[PDB]
Every structure is written in structure tokens, then in C-alpha cells.
Design a protein around this ligand. Structure first.
Ligand SMILES: COc1cc(C(=O)NC2CCN(C)CC2)ccc1Nc1ncc2c(n1)N(C1CCCC1)CC(F)(F)C(=O)N2C
Length: 113
């Protein structure tokens, strides 16, 4: 009943639910939680990536309605992908996995009424 802004935010909630769901778990799982640079022994990760982002953080912020509009939500989802492209070798499996998940994201986002 509140119009397009409310509807866009609800649609974004749904995109996020889909990205976190079992449907995409073959490629989305590296993006469920913040990169644990200590556990992964990535001693240069936080020197290269200045603004880490991941789907659990997007969920915390979206559920708290910290994104004022759909573009703000998209910016953080795309930051997550961009961090992966920036840090990792371009032929790495994890870059292909980020790309598979971004194909889903961009498709759903483009079809937001
Ligand atoms: C428990 O989680 C993992 C476990 C294993 C795992 O189980 N690895 C090995 C354990 C020991 N040997 C035997 C081989 C598998 C590998 C990766 C994991 N998780 C992860 N999450 C996120 C990123 C990532 N990884 N990336 C990968 C690239 C290659 C090494 C980290 C680089 C990155 F920079 F952090 C990045 O951008 N992303 C998005």
C-alpha cells in the first residue's frame, strides 16, 4: 500500500533470500559470510580490500532498513562481487563462482518492477 519504494525494498529482500537459498548453493556459498582472512591465511586480504562485504552483512543492513533505496542495496551486493574480482586471480574458480551468482543477481535486479 506504500508505493514503489516500499515495493522495491521488498523485491530486494526477495532477491537476497534467493541468493542465500539452497537453490544457488553450488556457487554462492563463499559469499554467505565475511571472508575470514585469518582462517584462509590471506595475509594481504585487508590490505587490498578496504570495504569487505558479504551476503550476511547485506541481510543485516537490509533487515534493519539501512539501505534507503534499491540502488543502495545493489551497491553493496555489487561491492561484494567487485571485491572478489579485485583480490583474486582472474582465472580463479572463486571469480567464476562470483560471476555465476552475479548473473543471478543482475537478472533478478533488472526485472524489478
Ligand atoms: C571455509 O571457507 C572456505 C574453505 C575453503 C577450503 O576448504 N580450502 C582448502 C582446505 C585445505 N586444502 C586441502 C584444499 C581446500 C576454501 C575457501 C573457503 N571460503 C572462501 N570464502 C570466500 C572467499 C574465498 N574462500 N576465496 C578462496 C579462494 C582460494 C582460497 C580462498 C578467496 C577470497 F579472497 F577470500 C574471496 O574473495 N572469497 C569470496
Amino acid at each position: 500500500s506504500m508505493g514503489k519504494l516500499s515495493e522495491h525494498l521488498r523485491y530486494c529482500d526477495s532477491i537476497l533470500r534467493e541468493m542465500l537459498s539452497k537453490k544457488h548453493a553450488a556457487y554462492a556459498w563463499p559469499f554467505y559470510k565475511p571472508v575470514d582472512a585469518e582462517a584462509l591465511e590471506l595475509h594481504d586480504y585487508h590490505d587490498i580490500i578496504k570495504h569487505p562485504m558479504d551476503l550476511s552483512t547485506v541481510k543485516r543492513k537490509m533487515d534493519g532498513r539501512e539501505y534507503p533505496d534499491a540502488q543502495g542495496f545493489a551497491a553493496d551486493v555489487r561491492l561484494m562481487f567487485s571485491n572478489c574480482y579485485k583480490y583474486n586471480p582472474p582465472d580463479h574458480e572463486v571469480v567464476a563462482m562470483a560471476r555465476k551468482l552475479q548473473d543471478v543477481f543482475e537478472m533478478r535486479f533488472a526485472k524489478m518492477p
